[PDB]
């Protein structure tokens, strides 16, 4: 049954061979052809492992490793996947000497707890009261992209919207309740964070429509307006100009008691979810509730329904009949601004008790490829800064904390006794594949100046000068996930079919 | 290129994984078939890398590795190639890493230099405090290389025959010792209780008739015994290819001028010969090797006679005695020569119940021999089993990253090579290796530096103190010399050509 | 110990084994004859055996089986030995014959 | 056509290659297997390409200008053989474009023609300037001793390497005069050097505690027939029936021994040696008159005997001349090694002389001697030629620098044959930093940086890693090298790329 | 014989290793290879993998009415089955023994084996407050083999709380589960309400 | 199928060489021309180097 | 490991059945077919027939010495020695 687990080892290690050499931004593409003929390439190690097609399943759990990685530090994606092929390589040599591989999954867990402990002794603890170190991290950390110079503005930018969601002493922060919201025109160094929210649609297109409306009260209706569509089969012939507007004026009776019954409520501003099945609005509700002075804003994507139930603290309307005033928002101004064939709508002042850290931050250009950019560009920027909250402190990257780490558990773990000493001290020699992918993508001599960092770490310290700062979240994630996932690999003792 | 980095790793590799498992007191036996037909069972790698032929020309390197060590030490035969291959399996996982191997070889250099100088501080002395002191640690030191072999029996009567053998062939003040002196003879048959230790030669004879005395006469207060040694037997004469009564009286008239009592020639005698003899008091003997007479003339002080005119007085050897003692109910009945005095050789009596059985007990008895005399040349003595490589191995590691360079990957790839041995020695005491390293190095580390040995022979510890457990610091120095010198040997050839057989 | 818990309980069914073959060569039935023998032997009162005549268990006294001493020695102390050492080669090397 | 010279061009390769490692004194060494079942392993390039004979035609002409060259000079046999080889390298891709072979065949010799210039240009004859006698040759000797397991003990090898040179005439100097004898076991330290000839002393017979070791003046005399009793295969068949003629006859045989046996005392000669063994019947006669005899000498430690007391070889007892007799100044048997050596000590008339070492095994030595013969060569050819080159990338990179300036005056295919010539002459400082270890991509391209200063003495250091002048490092090489291995290299290149079809003929 | 001795050796043999604390976890793969689940149920590997031996499907209606009265060691029953059947067929070739023989030596066997745990078994019933932690003991060992043994140091007093405020029949219908997403393992609290 | 290391590598430079060696015969004024021949069997012949390679089949991703 | 084990078993294979006085007879026959014999002696039995393996010669030695010693029960000590092996 070995043959099974040595088999898993090696199918999972020539995927890490291959990613190991695209970490950093001297890293090296891979060229991928999907079975469609769509030819693409890029050096994401989340992208490559997504559209590789993977069959096997114990390979498939390096892309959940990947997903859970960017979902909770949102960096280092490429490097926690060479730390799991790295154990499961060293791991290879400790199964020739006849050891079981729970005791291999068993050691990992003293290894990777006791690793937290003394990455924070050589981090330096920061704060969040301190903005100058906040914004040159978040800057910095933008040199990936592809504007450099317009880097400069967008640090300040994410950085002082964590802090006003944020408090003292944080934990969870959900980076998922900002939402990026793109749009054609503008430029980037014209930016604007929205308190409330901010829709992905106008308002009304035709005439009478207000588009603008003070103190105004939003909420979400499920329910639309529509002539009434049995689902029996019917048949309207009408043979004479009397019964046409004798179907119309029942008709017209349906559609202006839905209007009735909203206006008595005192809707300012009114949600329609978009449905392509039948019709959300019917043209003559849209002339009957323009001389109400109601704002109607229709074209909701099914994405933003969960978005909108939350952050404004209204609650979804299935019926007209629990329809009460009690279930809607509160906005203080609701106005639609229009800057280069814009028509965007913004929302401020919820003042709600049940508002929560939503704030939405609007993203303009001229070319598809500006929105795009950049809606990833700030998208690592939050995570960066996510890092922080959740632990205090950062590190210097580069593959030093690698070294630094292996160097002190080797050391320590001499004073041991019998097993502890041998089987423990192997995770120590796994960390320095992560600074030897950064010296050979780089052109630098991979056993060269590895010896070279073990020489500084003696006499000098982790660090800083070249602006280069890594969060400890990263590596803190990365140890963590990659004993998880060791540790499910080796806990499989065979693969049988089962239908 | 690549593939001959990777060959010559795996083919030293597969060599030396014959005799890992044979390497200790507890190792295990092989079969070997002589050309003729008979089967050898022996533990030792001389008898066994000798009788294995191969064709590889990187294994004969480990041939002549412990060709030379064999006539130093001889116990470390199957130790320096382990212990070698072990460098070889640190070595390829450089290679690989993309380190040239010219500096793989010279960082091996650096490594052995610096162990050895921590090894001269912790070593301790016998013979500089008592005289008395150095034999009682030297009279239990034999005991341990004869716990494998079935000597393991017997071993408290066999460990004073290595002692008093080497004190002889030796001086206060030269304290000189070579294997040359001392003679290894056995024959099959009979048992081990009954062999003792004597001093002298066996020609193992019967006196040719009953009637002659068994004991020689001092022959009125004379000086010895005087015993002639010649080329040609004691008879009237034959040709080769295809008067004697008075040829006897021309003889015996030779013998009583020079005074010499016992004849040892090379072939046999006439019956009719020694029927004079009788009364005349001149005891006869037939039938010796050509070999045992130039050992006769070494302990005896004698000379070679080739005629009967050359007798002379100062080429007749001298001994105390000459008897024949019988051993047991066997009807051999050899004759047994004694010196009393300081002589310049010795001689081993060894007997066993079977062939192979006088072997084992010949080559382990000799093996302790070995080790005296390097106890004897270096004062300087360590306990050597599972000492060396646990503490060898963890001063290194420490000064490793000190140096700061390309040698500090080399310095931690030789301790973990040193790991091999103690490793070995657990995988055939029994127990398990990995627990087994760290327990000998914890314990040199909280507590003090020490020598604590493997559970091999077994103790209520893993301390070698107590066991009397001492090996030569001349031979461990020697022992990872030769074994760091053929490493670098070995990678030092870059291209195999091996042509045809013609 | 651990590991000679095992080697030494081998040793007593291995001494079970040359009655077993015995009962296999005259015919009769291995496994209910030494079984049975086991039993009266194991507490108290050792005196029957195997009888290869009729099928059952009678005293060997009475019918007059009996071995000697030194002879019986030899059997368990060179087997013993020889056993160790055909155990002990984990290899085997023949020359070139000639 | 084509395909021929291809195949020819991967011959020289396959050839080269092996010959790559055993480039420089820290290169590695080959391992070749004799159908003689003789293992011999050398980083010689004579005796590399002297054993593998190689039925290739084209090989063999690599195999041929090596015999060349150690007879002219006998120094540089392996890089003669790379830099010959390496123009088929150069060569191949200029093949396939269409150029002619003899046009740039013809392009080389115009660059060694200008090479050969450069290197007159580059040596400078010094002697007694900013030097002095004795320190001249040590100096030499510690180059070729560093990055050695003896460079710890090389203080006490120089003093005996030196006086080994100067112990012969300094008109007529020959490496095989200067002879080496392996002493297993001992310190390295302890060696001594001895003005005569020693042998292997593998006399086995009985006999000792006689004939003693300290002589005066002892009489050399060479011994052909064998002195002992029983014969090695004749006897003499005698058929009689007397008791007392059996006696008769064993005498009668050794009458006609000691005829001869006795003839030799006449002679009064205390050394007597012999190609045959000696028994114990001749040794026991003259253990009373103190006269010593040793049998077993191999054939080529004779001849040193003759050459040293001035003796002859004669082959009864009876014709022997007084003259041919000679003597030493002190004769002594050591002990050292667990083994008797008899040694000559004070020969004025000694043409050779022995150098014995000593050490921990026999397998240790032999790199020491090896590592000693390099620099053998460096002092005897220091007295001999006064005309000197730097080495160690020295001149190596400067005869490749002054091609390329020269090429941009010529126009033509020759310009880029030149170039390409240039080019071929770094292999040879190429396989000197991968066999010493260090990194051949970043010390080739930081030796071109000084190299450009104007400066042409930077060479290779060969100790520690780094780019330098080895006029500190007394790096020292003749000028005959230089130049005969340009025209060696040049000539067996030409003969093989002029090789348009091969033609084989069995039987 | 060969074909139902082997085969039930070889279902002991696929959930061998999910028995104990200590124990793996079995990958199973379907065609659609997207239903794959890493679980260490015996009972889920057992009914979810299908067989074709007929001797094989006894062992798999036997383990549902085993996890309907208590719902753990099902694995256990499994392997020591299975250990009978293995043992056996040394029993019948080469021991010269009858089937139905074995088949009444496990009868004579299973009363020395519920008589040893008889005068094993001790109980205490005063000071009920060591009776409570024995219930601590004994949820630790049911909780053992899952995910939920990290926080089981805590999740020890919510089991063994939770059974002391029933106090009547043994149905389970008392006690609802309630699973929410969000918050950690070690939040779940006893309610009454 | 996969393939990485030194093997890759070699067929990029392959691939890339029949490709290239289209256009060295019609660079510059005294270059050559070639017909472009389609499935159906029509062709035709230009001396314009980008619409040969306009039209060109690359079958290989690396050209 | 393989080799020294069967081939122990194959030499006691032969004479398991020639223990006791109700065991059975092994029959040998040769090329010539017309030395064949009925005996159940393990020393006849062992001596007689040839064998390929090394380690099983072994065996055969040691009976030989054992077999002068006493003279009888060598059958028992060969089955003996290959039960201890067997179980092994």
Same mark, same amino acid.
């Given at each position: ?77 490429? !490097? ?63 040199? !990936? ?184 928002? !509160? ?169 | ?168 062939? #030796? ?40 009637? #002659? ?120 009945? #050899? ?153 670098? #040997? ?13 | ?98 | ?507 | ?193 | ?63």
């Amino acid at each position: 049954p070995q043959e099974v687990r040595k088999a898993n080892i090696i199918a999972a290690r020539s995927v890490a061979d291959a990613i190991r050499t695209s970490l950093g931004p001297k890293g090296m593409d891979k060229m991928i052809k999907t079975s469609r003929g769509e030819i693409i390439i890029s050096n994401d190690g989340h992208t490559i492992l997504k559209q590789m097609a993977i069959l096997h399943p114990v390979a498939r759990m390096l892309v959940e490793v990947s997903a859970a990685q960017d979902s909770e530090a949102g960096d280092g994606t490429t !490097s926690v996947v060479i730390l799991t092929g790295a154990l499961l390589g060293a791991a290879e040599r400790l199964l020739n000497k006849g050891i079981h591989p729970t005791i291999i999954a068993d050691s990992f867990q003293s290894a990777a707890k006791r690793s937290v402990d003394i990455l924070l002794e050589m981090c330096h603890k920061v704060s969040l009261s301190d903005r100058e170190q906040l914004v040159r991290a978040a800057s910095t950390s933008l040199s !990936s992209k592809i504007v450099s110079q317009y880097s400069s503005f967008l640090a300040p930018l994410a950085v002082d919207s964590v802090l006003k969601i944020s408090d003292e002493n944080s934990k969870n922060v959900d980076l998922n309740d900002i939402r990026l919201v793109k749009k054609v025109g503008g430029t980037i160094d014209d930016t604007e964070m929205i308190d409330g929210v901010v829709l992905t649609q106008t308002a009304i297109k035709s005439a009478g429509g207000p588009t603008r409306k003070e103190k105004a009260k939003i909420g979400l209706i499920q329910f639309q307006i529509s002539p009434p569509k049995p689902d029996t089969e019917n048949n309207i012939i009408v043979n004479d100009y009397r019964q046409m507007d004798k179907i119309l004026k029942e008709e017209r009776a349906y559609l202006l008691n839905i209007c009735k019954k909203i206006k008595k409520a005192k809707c300012n501003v009114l949600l329609i979810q978009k449905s392509i099945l039948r019709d959300a609005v019917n043209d003559l509700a849209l002339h009957f509730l323009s001389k109400l002075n109601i704002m109607v804003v229709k074209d909701i994507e099914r994405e933003e329904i969960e978005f909108l139930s939350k952050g404004l603290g209204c609650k979804p309307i299935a019926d007209i009949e629990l329809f009460t005033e009690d279930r809607l928002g !509160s906005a203080d101004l609701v106005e639609e601004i229009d800057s280069d064939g814009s028509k965007i709508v913004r929302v401020t002042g919820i003042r709600n008790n049940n508002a929560r850290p939503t704030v939405s931050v609007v993203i303009r250009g001229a070319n598809n490829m500006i929105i795009d950019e950049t809606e990833r560009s700030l998208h690592d920027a939050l995570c960066v800064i996510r890092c922080l909250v959740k632990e205090r402190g950062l590190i210097a990257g580069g593959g030093a904390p690698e070294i630094e780490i292996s160097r002190r558990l080797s050391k320590e773990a001499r004073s041991m006794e019998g097993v502890q000493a041998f089987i423990w001290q192997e995770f120590a020699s796994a960390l320095e594949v992560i600074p030897t992918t950064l010296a050979e993508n780089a052109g630098l001599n991979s056993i060269k100046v590895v010896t070279e960092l073990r020489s500084k770490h003696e006499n000098g310290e982790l660090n800083y000068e070249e602006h280069i700062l890594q969060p400890v979240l990263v590596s803190t994630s990365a140890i963590t996930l990659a004993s998880e996932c060791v540790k499910s690999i080796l806990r499989i003792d065979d693969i049988a079919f089962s239908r | 290129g690549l593939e001959a980095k990777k060959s010559h790793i795996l083919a030293a590799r597969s060599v030396a994984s014959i005799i890992k498992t044979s390497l200790g007191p507890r190792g295990l036996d092989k079969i070997l078939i002589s050309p003729d037909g008979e089967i050898t069972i022996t533990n030792d790698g001389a008898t066994i890398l000798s009788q294995m032929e191969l064709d590889n020309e990187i294994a004969k390197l480990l041939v002549q590795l412990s060709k030379s060590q064999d006539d130093e030490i001889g116990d470390g035969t199957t130790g320096v190639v382990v212990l070698a291959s072990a460098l070889l399996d640190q070595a390829l996982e450089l290679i690989q890493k993309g380190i040239h191997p010219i500096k793989i070889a010279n960082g091996f250099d650096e490594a052995a230099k610096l162990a050895i100088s921590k090894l001269e501080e912790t070593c301790d002395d016998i013979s500089a405090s008592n005289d008395e002191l150095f034999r009682d640690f030297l009279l239990r030191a034999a005991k341990t290389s004869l716990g494998s072999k079935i000597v393991s029996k017997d071993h408290d009567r066999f460990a004073e025959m290595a002692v008093e053998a080497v004190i002889n062939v #030796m001086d206060k003040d030269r304290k000189d010792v070579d294997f040359d002196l001392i003679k290894m003879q056995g024959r099959v048959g009979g048992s081990i209780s009954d062999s003792k230790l004597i001093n002298g030669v066996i020609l193992d004879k019967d006196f040719s008739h009953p009637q #002659m005395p068994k004991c020689v006469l001092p022959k009125e207060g004379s000086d010895g015994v005087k015993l002639a040694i010649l080329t040609c037997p004691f008879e009237p004469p034959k040709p080769k290819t295809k008067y004697e009564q008075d040829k006897f009286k021309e003889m015996i008239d030779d013998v009583k001028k020079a005074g010499a009592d016992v004849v040892i020639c090379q072939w046999g005698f006439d019956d009719e010969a020694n029927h004079l003899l009788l009364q005349n008091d001149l005891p006869a003997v037939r039938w010796v090797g050509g070999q045992e007479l130039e050992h006769i003339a070494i302990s005896t002080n004698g000379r070679i006679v080739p005629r009967f005119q050359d007798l002379s007085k100062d080429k007749l050897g001298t001994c105390s005695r000459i008897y024949e003692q019988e051993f047991g109910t066997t009807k051999d009945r #050899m004759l047994i020569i004694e010196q009393s005095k300081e002589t310049k050789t010795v001689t081993c009596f060894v007997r066993g119940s079977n062939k192979m059985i006088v072997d084992e007990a010949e080559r382990a008895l000799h093996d302790s021999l070995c080790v005296v005399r390097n106890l004897v040349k270096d004062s300087r003595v360590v306990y050597g089993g599972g000492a060396a490589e646990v503490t060898m191995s963890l001063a290194v590691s420490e000064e490793a990253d000190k140096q700061r360079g390309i040698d500090q990957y080399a310095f931690r790839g030789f301790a973990q090579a040193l790991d091999t041995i103690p490793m070995t020695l657990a995988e055939n005491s029994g127990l398990d290796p990995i627990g087994t390293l760290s327990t000998l190095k914890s314990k040199q580390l909280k507590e003090k530096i020490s020598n604590i040995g493997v559970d091999c022979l077994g103790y209520g510890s893993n301390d070698m103190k107590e066991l009397f457990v001492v090996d030569p610091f001349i031979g461990k120095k020697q022992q990872i010399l030769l074994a760091t010198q053929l490493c670098r #040997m070995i990678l030092k050839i870059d291209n195999v050509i091996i042509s045809g057989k013609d | 110990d651990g590991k000679k818990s095992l080697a030494v309980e081998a040793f007593a069914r291995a001494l079970r084994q040359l009655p077993t073959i015995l009962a296999d060569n005259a015919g009769f039935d291995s496994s209910e004859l030494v079984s049975k023998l086991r039993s009266s032997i194991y507490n108290g009162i050792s005196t029957s055996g195997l009888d290869l005549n009729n099928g059952t268990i009678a005293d060997m006294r009475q019918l007059g089986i009996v071995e000697s001493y030194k002879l019986k020695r030899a059997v368990v102390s060179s087997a013993s030995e020889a056993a160790e050492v055909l155990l002990r080669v984990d290899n085997i090397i023949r020359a070139r014959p000639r | 056509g084509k395909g021929q010279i291809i195949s020819n061009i991967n011959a020289c390769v396959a050839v080269q290659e092996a010959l790559k490692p055993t480039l420089g004194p820290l290169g590695s060494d080959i391992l070749i297997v004799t159908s003689n079942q003789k293992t011999t392993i050398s980083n010689d390039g004579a005796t590399i390409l002297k054993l593998l004979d190689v039925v290739h035609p084209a090989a063999k002409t690599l195999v041929d200008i090596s015999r060349a060259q150690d007879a002219e000079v006998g120094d540089g046999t392996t890089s003669v053989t790379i830099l010959a080889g390496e123009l088929m390298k150069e060569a191949k891709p200029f093949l396939e474009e269409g150029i002619s072979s003899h046009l740039i065949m013809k392009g080389y010799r115009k660059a060694v023609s200008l090479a050969v210039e450069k290197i007159n240009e580059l040596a400078v004859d010094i002697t007694s300037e900013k030097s002095s006698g004795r320190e001249l040759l040590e100096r030499c000797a510690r180059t070729a001793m560093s990055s050695k397991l003896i460079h710890n003990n090389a203080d006490f090898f120089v003093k005996m390497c030196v006086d080994a040179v100067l112990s012969l005439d300094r008109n007529d100097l020959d490496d095989k005069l200067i002879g080496i004898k392996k002493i297993p076991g001992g310190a390295m330290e302890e060696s001594l050097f001895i003005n005569g000839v020693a042998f292997k002393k593998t006399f086995s017979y009985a006999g000792f505690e006689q004939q003693p070791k300290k002589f005066n003046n002892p009489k050399i005399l060479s011994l052909n027939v064998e002195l002992e009793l029983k014969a090695e295969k004749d006897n003499a068949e005698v058929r009689v029936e007397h008791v007392e003629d059996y006696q008769a006859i064993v005498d009668a045989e050794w009458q006609l021994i000691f005829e001869k046996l006795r003839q030799v005392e006449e002679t009064g000669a205390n050394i007597v040696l012999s190609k045959l063994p000696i028994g114990d019947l001749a040794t026991q006669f003259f253990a009373d008159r103190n006269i010593f005899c040793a049998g077993r000498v191999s054939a080529d430690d004779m001849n040193r005997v003759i050459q040293a007391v001035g003796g002859s070889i004669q082959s009864t007892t009876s014709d022997i001349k007084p003259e041919h007799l000679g003597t030493c100044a002190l004769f002594e048997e050591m002990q050292i090694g667990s083994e008797r050596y008899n040694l000559f000590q004070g020969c004025p008339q000694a043409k050779t002389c022995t150098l014995l070492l000593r050490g921990g095994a026999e397998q240790v030595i032999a790199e020491v001697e090896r590592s000693l013969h390099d620099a053998i060569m460096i002092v005897k050819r220091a007295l001999q030629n006064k005309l000197i080159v730097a080495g160690g990338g020295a001149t190596e990179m400067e005869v490749s620098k002054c091609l390329r300036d020269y090429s941009k005056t010529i126009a033509g295919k020759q310009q880029m044959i030149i170039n390409a010539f240039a080019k071929a002459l770094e292999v040879i400082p190429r396989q000197l930093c991968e066999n010493a270890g260090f990194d051949a991509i970043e010390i080739l391209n930081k030796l071109r940086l000084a190299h450009s200063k104007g400066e042409k003495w930077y060479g290779v250091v060969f100790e520690t890693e780094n780019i330098g002048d080895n006029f500190a490092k007394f790096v020292w090489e003749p000028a005959l090298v230089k130049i005969n291995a340009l025209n060696s290299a040049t000539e067996a290149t030409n003969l093989i790329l002029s090789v348009d079809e091969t033609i084989t003929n069995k039987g | 014989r060969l074909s139902a001795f082997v085969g039930a050796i070889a279902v002991g043999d696929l959930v061998k290793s999910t028995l104990g604390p200590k124990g793996m976890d079995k990958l199973l793969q379907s065609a659609s290879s997207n239903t794959c689940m890493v679980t260490n149920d015996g009972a889920t590997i057992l009914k979810s993998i299908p067989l074709d031996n007929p001797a094989a499907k006894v062992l798999v209606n036997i383990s549902k009415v085993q996890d309907d009265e208590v719902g753990d060691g099902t694995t256990s029953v499994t392997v020591l089955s299975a250990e009978l059947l293995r043992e056996a067929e040394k029993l019948i070739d080469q021991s010269k023994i009858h089937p139905q023989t074995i088949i009444e030596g496990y009868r004579l066997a299973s009363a020395a084996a519920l008589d040893a745990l008889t005068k094993a078994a001790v109980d205490n019933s005063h000071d009920k407050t060591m009776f409570r932690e024995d219930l601590i003991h004994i949820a630790k060992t049911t909780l053992s083999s899952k995910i939920l043994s990290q926080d089981k140091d805590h999740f020890a007093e919510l089991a063994t709380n939770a059974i002391l405020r029933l106090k009547g029949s043994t149905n389970l219908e008392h006690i609802q589960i309630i699973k929410i997403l969000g918050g950690k393992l070690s939040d779940s609290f006893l309610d009454e309400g | 199928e996969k393939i990485s290391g030194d093997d890759i590598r070699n067929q990029n430079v392959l691939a890339t060489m029949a490709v290239a060696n289209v256009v060295k015969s019609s660079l510059g004024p005294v270059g050559l021309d070639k017909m472009l021949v389609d499935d159906i069997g029509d062709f035709t012949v230009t001396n314009d180097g980008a619409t040969i390679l306009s039209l060109l089949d690359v079958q290989h991703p690396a050209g």
